[PDB]
Amino acid sequence: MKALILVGGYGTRLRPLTLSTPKPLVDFCNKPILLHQVEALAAAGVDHVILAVSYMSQVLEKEMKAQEQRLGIRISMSHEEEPLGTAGPLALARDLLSETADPFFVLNSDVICDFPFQAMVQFHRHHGQEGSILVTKVEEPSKYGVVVCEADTGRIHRFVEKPQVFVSNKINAGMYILSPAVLQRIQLQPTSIEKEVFPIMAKEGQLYAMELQGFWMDIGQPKDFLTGMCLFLQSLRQKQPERLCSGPGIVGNVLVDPSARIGQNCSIGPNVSLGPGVVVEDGVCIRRCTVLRDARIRSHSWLESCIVGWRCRVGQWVRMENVTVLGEDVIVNDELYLNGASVLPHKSIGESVPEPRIIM
Amino acid sequence: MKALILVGGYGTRLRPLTLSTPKPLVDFCNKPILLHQVEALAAAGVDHVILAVSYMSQVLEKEMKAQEQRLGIRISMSHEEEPLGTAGPLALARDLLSETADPFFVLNSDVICDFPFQAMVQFHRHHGQEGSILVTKVEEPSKYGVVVCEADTGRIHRFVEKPQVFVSNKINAGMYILSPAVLQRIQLQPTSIEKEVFPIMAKEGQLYAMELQGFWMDIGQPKDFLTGMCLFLQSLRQKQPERLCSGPGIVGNVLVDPSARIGQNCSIGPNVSLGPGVVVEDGVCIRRCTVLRDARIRSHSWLESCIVGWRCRVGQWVRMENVTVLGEDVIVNDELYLNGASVLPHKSIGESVPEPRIIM
Numbered sequence: 255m256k257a258l259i260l261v262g263g264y265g266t267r268l269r270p271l272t273l274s275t276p277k278p279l280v281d282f283c284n285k286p287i288l289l290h291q292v293e294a295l296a297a298a299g300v301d302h303v304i305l306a307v308s309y310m311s312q313v314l315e316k317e318m319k320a321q322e323q324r325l326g327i328r329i330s331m332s333h334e335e336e337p338l339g340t341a342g343p344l345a346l347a348r349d350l351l352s353e354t355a356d357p358f359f360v361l362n363s364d365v366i367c368d369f370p371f372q373a374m375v376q377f378h379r380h381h382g383q384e385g386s387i388l389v390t391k392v393e394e395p396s397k398y399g400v401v402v403c404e405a406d407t408g409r410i411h412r413f414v415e416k417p418q419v420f421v422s423n424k425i426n427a428g429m430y431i432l433s434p435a436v437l438q439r440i441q442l443q444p445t446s447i448e449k450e451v452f453p454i455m456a457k458e459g460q461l462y463a464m465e466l467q468g469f470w471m472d473i474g475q476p477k478d479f480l481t482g483m484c485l486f487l488q489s490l491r492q493k494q495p496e497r498l499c500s501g502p503g504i505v506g507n508v509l510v511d512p513s514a515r516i517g518q519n520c521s522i523g524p525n526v527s528l529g530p531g532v533v534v535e536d537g538v539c540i541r542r543c544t545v546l547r548d549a550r551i552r553s554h555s556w557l558e559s560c561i562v563g564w565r566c567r568v569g570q571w572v573r574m575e576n577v578t579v580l581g582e583d584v585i586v587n588d589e590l591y592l593n594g595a596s597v598l599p600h601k602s603i604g605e606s607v608p609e610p611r612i613i614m
Numbered sequence: 615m616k617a618l619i620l621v622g623g624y625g626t627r628l629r630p631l632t633l634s635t636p637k638p639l640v641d642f643c644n645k646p647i648l649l650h651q652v653e654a655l656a657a658a659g660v661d662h663v664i665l666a667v668s669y670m671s672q673v674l675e676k677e678m679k680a681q682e683q684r685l686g687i688r689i690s691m692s693h694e695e696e697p698l699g700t701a702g703p704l705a706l707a708r709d710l711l712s713e714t715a716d717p718f719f720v721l722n723s724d725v726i727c728d729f730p731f732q733a734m735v736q737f738h739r740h741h742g743q744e745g746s747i748l749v750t751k752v753e754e755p756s757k758y759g760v761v762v763c764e765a766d767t768g769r770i771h772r773f774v775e776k777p778q779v780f781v782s783n784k785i786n787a788g789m790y791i792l793s794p795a796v797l798q799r800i801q802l803q804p805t806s807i808e809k810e811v812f813p814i815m816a817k818e819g820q821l822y823a824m825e826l827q828g829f830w831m832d833i834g835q836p837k838d839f840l841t842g843m844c845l846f847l848q849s850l851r852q853k854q855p856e857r858l859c860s861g862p863g864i865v866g867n868v869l870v871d872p873s874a875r876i877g878q879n880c881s882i883g884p885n886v887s888l889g890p891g892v893v894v895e896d897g898v899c900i901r902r903c904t905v906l907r908d909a910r911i912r913s914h915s916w917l918e919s920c921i922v923g924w925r926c927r928v929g930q931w932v933r934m935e936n937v938t939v940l941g942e943d944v945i946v947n948d949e950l951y952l953n954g955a956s957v958l959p960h961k962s963i964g965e966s967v968p969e970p971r972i973i974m
C-alpha cells in the first residue's frame with residue numbers, strides 16, 4: 255500500500271529534547287520512533303511511504319534517505335516550508351496519493367503501540383466507507399479527540415467533545431486508513447486533520463472505529479515518554495526476553511544497548527533503556543529512566559524517572575527525580591539535586607533545582 | 615591590522631532569541647551586532663577579520679561571506695568544531711594571527727560601544743608590553759569580574775573577581791589589543807581568555823588598562839539588551855539625529871526601518887526600534903521595546919520593556935510588559951496580560967501570565 259506519516263511538527267511538548275533533534279528522531283528505546291512506525295509498515299507490506307516534512311528537514315531527510323535503502327522500499331518525502339498542520343500534508347501529497355483507488359495510511363509520529371495494520375485493513379473492508387480510525391480506551395487522558403462509537407459495527411455517532419468524558423471511555427489513537435475520495439475534501443490550506451475533516455466525517459458516518467488490543471501510548475510528553483518506555487519494555491518482556499539485559503545488578507526490564515557500558519556495584523533498576531554509547535560509572539542507581547546517546551553518568555548518582563539527553567555529563571552524587579529532562583550537552587556539577595528541571599541544551603548546572611523549573 | 619571577533623559561544627543568556635538565530639546575528643538597533651563590530655572595524659582600518667564560528671556555523675557564515683564583499687574587507691573564519699571556549703579560537707587561528715609580529719584586535723560578540731580603535735592602537739604602543747584591555751567604569755560593581763589598575767600605566771594587578779570586590783569599580787569592556795607572543799601562551803584545548811590567559815598575564819605585568827568615555831553595554835542578558843538599545847538611541851540622538859524617526863505620534867528616540875509601517879492614532883514611545891517589515895496597527899502604544907522583523911502587533915495593544923522576535927503576532931488588547939521576550943513565531947492571543955514571559959519559539963499562548971516565567 256502507500257502510506258503517510260506526517261512528520262514535521264515542532265515538538266513543543268517534549269521541548270528540550272525536540273530543540274536539538276526533530277520529534278520523530280528522538281531515540282525511543284534505542285531506535286527512533288519514526289523508525290519504529292516505518293519498520294512496522296515494512297513488516298505490514300506497505301511498499302511506499304512519504305514523509306510530510308515541515309521543520310528540520312535536513313536531519314530527517316538524511317537519516318530517512320539512508321534507511322530507504324536500508325530496507326527494500328521506495329520512500330520519498332514531501333517538503334513543506336510553511337507548516338500546514340496535520341491535514342495539509344494530505345492535499346500536498348495528493349499528487350501521488352490520488353493515483354489509484356486504494357486506501358492510504360495516515361499515522362501520527364508520536365504514537366507507539368503494536369500496530370494492527372492487517373487487522374484494521376480487515377476491519378476497513380467491511381464497512382467500505384471513507385475513513386477508518388483505531389481508538390484506545392483510557393480513563394484519565396482526554397487530550398486527544400475522545401470518540402463515541404457504536405456496537406461491533408463500529409460506526410462513529412460523535413467525537414471531539416471536550417474533556418468531561420462521562421463514560422465514553424475511548425480516545426482515538428491517531429491512526430487512520432483513508433479512502434482516496436476524502437483526499438479531494440481536504441484542501442491545501444493550513445488545516446488540522448483531527449478537528450476539521452473528522453467532525454463532518456463523524457456527522458456523515460464515514461469514520462468507523464477499530465479499537466485496540468493493548469499497549470498504546472502517545473509519547474509527545476516527557477512524562478508520557480517515560481510511561482510509554484515502561485509499556486514498551488513490558489511488551490518486549492512478553493515478546494523478546496533475550497533483548498532485555500539480565501545480570502546481577504539489573505532489576506526488572508532493562509534495555510541496554512551493546513555499545514553502552516555499566517560499571518560495577520551499580521543497580522540499574524526497573525524500566526531503564528540505556529542508549530548507544532552511555533557510560534554508567536561504578537555505583538549509580540538508575541530506575542525508570544531514559545539515557546540517550548553518549549551521555550556519561552558519573553558514579554554514586556541516583557536517577558529516577560528522568561530523560562538524560564545526548565552527550566550529557568551528570569556529575570557525582572547527583573540526584574535527579576520527578577521527570578527531569580536535560581537538553582543536549584547539559585553538564586550537571588557534582589552533589590546537585592534536580593527536581594523537575596527542564597534544562598535547555600548547552601547549559602552547565604552548578605546549582606540545585608529543588609522545585610520544577612525550566613532552567614534557562 | 616587583523617581582527618579576531620569571537621562569534622560561536624552559544625547565547626545561553628537571552629535564550630528565546632538565540633534558540634533560532636545566532637547571538638551575533640540577532641538584531642540590535644536594526645543591525646546585527648556583529649555587523650556593528652565589523653563595520654566600525656572596516657571604518658577604522660583593519661585589513662581583515664577572523665571569526666571563530668562554532669554554533670550555527672552555516673547560517674552565520676552564509677551572511678558573513680555575503681557582507682564581506684559589500685564592506686570591502688576580507689573575512690576569514692576559523693571554523694570551530696569542538697567549541698574551544700573563548701581563548702582556543704586564536705590557538706586555532708594561530709598561523710593566521712602569526713603571519714607578522716603585530717598586535718591584533720580581539721573583540722566580543724555582545725559588546726556595543728563607540729569603538730575607540732585608533733585611540734586604543736595608539737595606547738597599546740606606548741606601554742610596550744604584551745597585551746592591553748579596554749575597561750569601563752560602572753555605576754554599581756556588585757557581581758561581575760571587576761578590575762583594579764594603576765594610576766597612569768594602568769598595570770592591572772588582579773583581573774577576575776567574584777563579588778563583594780568594592781574597591782575596583784572598573785570592568786572589562788571586552789576589547790583587547792594583543793601582541794603575537796600572547797599567541798604562544800595558548801593551547802588547542804578549550805580554554806577561556808578571561809579565566810586563565812588574562813589571569814597569568816596579570817601575574818606577569820604585561821596586562822594594561824585604559825578606560826572608555828561612555829556608552830558601553832553588552833547584549834548577553836535581555837534586559838541588558840534593552841538598556842543597550844537606548845544607550846545606543848541616546849547616542850544616535852547625540853551624534854547622527856537624521857536616522858531617528860520623528861512624527862506627530864512619535865515621541866523620544868525611535869528607530870524605524872523604511873519597510874516598517876505604522877497605523878495612525880497610536881503612540882510609539884521612547885526607545886523603540888521597529889525592525890524591517892513590522893506592522894503596528896491603530897492605537898498600539900509601544901514604548902522601550904525592540905520589535906524584530908516581520909512582527910505584526912495588532913490594534914489597541916500596549917508594549918513596554920519587551921522584545922518581540924521574528925514573525926510574531928501580538929493580538930488585540932494585549933498588555934505585554936516587564937522584559938517579556940517572545941521567541942520567533944510566537945502568536946499571542948487577544949486580551950492577554952504578559953509579565954515576565956519568556957516564550958520559546960513556535961508556541962501560541964492562550965492564557966495570560968501574571969508572574970515572570972519561561973513558557974516552554
Ligand SMILES: Nc1nc2c(ncn2[C@@H]2O[C@H](COP(=O)(O)OP(=O)(O)OP(=O)(O)O)[C@@H](O)[C@H]2O)c(=O)[nH]1
Nearest residue numbers: 260261262263264266267306307308337338339363
Ligand atoms: N509534516 C508535517 N507534520 C506535521 C505538521 N504539523 C504537525 N505534524 C505532525 O503531527 C503529529 C502529531 O501532532 P502533535 O501530537 O500535536 O505533535 P506536534 O506536531 O509536535 O505539535 P505539538 O502539540 O506542539 O507538540 C506530529 O508527529 C507532527 O509530526 C506539519 O506541518 N507538517
Ligand SMILES: Nc1nc2c(ncn2[C@@H]2O[C@H](COP(=O)(O)OP(=O)(O)OP(=O)(O)O)[C@@H](O)[C@H]2O)c(=O)[nH]1
Nearest residue numbers: 620621622623624625626627666697699700722723
Ligand atoms: N568560537 C567560539 N566563540 C566563543 C565560544 N564561547 C564563547 N565564545 C565567545 O566568547 C565571548 C564571550 O562569551 P559570552 O559573552 O559569555 O557569550 P556566549 O558565548 O554567548 O555565552 P553565554 O552568554 O554565557 O551563554 C563571546 O564573543 C562569544 O562569541 C565558543 O565556544 N566558540
